[PDB]
Amino acid sequence: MKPYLFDLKLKDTEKLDWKKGLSSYLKKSYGSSQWRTFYDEKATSELDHLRNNANGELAPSSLSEQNLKYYSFLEHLYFRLGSKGSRLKMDFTWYDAEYSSAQKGLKYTQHTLAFEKSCTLFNIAVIFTQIARENINEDYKNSIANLTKAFSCFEYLSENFLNSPSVDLQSENTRFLANICHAEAQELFVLKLLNDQISSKQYTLISKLSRATCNLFQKCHDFMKEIDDDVAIYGEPKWKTTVTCKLHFYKSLSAYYHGLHLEEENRVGEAIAFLDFSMQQLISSLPFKTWLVEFIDFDGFKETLEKKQKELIKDNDFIYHESVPAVVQVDSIKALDAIKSPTWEKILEPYMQDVANKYDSLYRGII
Secondary structure (H helix, E strand, O other), rough: OOOOOOOOOOOEOOOOHHHHHHHHHHHHHHHOHHHHOOHHHHHHHHHHHHHHHHHOOOOOHHHHHHHHHHHHHHHHHHHHHHHHHHHHHOOOEEOOOOOOOHHHHHHEEEHHHHHHHHHHHHHHHHHHHHEEEEEEEOOOHHHHHHHHHHHHHHHHHHHHHOOOOOOHHOHHHHHHHHHHHHHHHHHHHHHOOOOOOOHOHHHHHHHHHHHHHHHHHHHHHHHOOOOOOOOOOOOOHHHHHHHHHHHHHHHHHHHHHHHHHHHHOOOOHHHHHHHHHHHHHHHHHHHHHHOOOOOOOHHHHHHHHHHHHHHHHHHHHOOOOOOOOOOHHHHHHOOOOOOOOOOOHHHHHHHHHHHHHOOHHHHHHHH
16 A cells, blocks of 8 residues: 655745844934944844745755744743843734635734744644655654654644734644544554554554554544535645545554454454445445555455455354344454654754753843
């Protein structure tokens, strides 16, 4: 099976002149004969460059680095100025992410540090998903780790910024994005074990992990259900059908593996009941397979189930006379969530020290 990852969009921003903006503030705060004393030309020049590099053509990991460093600058500035940060009157200007259903050039200008911070962190989260996409070539280890961090960033955004002028930062939309990243991270974890000759035999394990994958996509499904307008859903219209397909597909995969376990425990008939359920779920996913036909061999899996379903039935109708439960216990399979997200605070922490030292003089000049 080939992994199918959603392509998230970055928010664009207008070039901001920190040099002109900071000197102007200073010239207005102190006389034209005093302001230069409070200005750090070198640091301010480097800062202006840093912001441009956090929004340019750098490769994913390097682009991420620029953004984490720039956020650090902002966080320390906020620790020192707080809501007074708006007095700088910096014209922070950001555009809404461009998917399809969204606008084609909707932008806002706001002076609060929270606006500049939230938008930057939104891009940091997106960049983590881009790094995961780019490294989807290894054993999934790196991609899982990066999707996990994306999850953490979107989660912090949904819980910490509540009245953003941008649709991208609405609490319910960042929560949706966080749930997408968590679901994908779990999904890649399952795919990984299925590549391990040894782990691919731990039927019980795969089953539990698969159930968790299903439950996670169920969250995204539920969010997009409250809205029946395909052109009204937040992200890409194409995502709705794929999320629905995945939820049924992983539920099917879960039942299948639990069945292989039941057969291992010589509990045929009970196993046949679960293979029965598995087939049902797989069929339920078919109408939504549109974009995954080249990533998941749907027809091959249908054959694998029927094939196994046969064997169990044959060696039972006249050899292992056992009843077959009408409706198996769905909660018989206990989901296992393998993704432990770190705090945004811990992700940012490694970058805070160097930034505080480099910009101390710049900060002191403001206060």
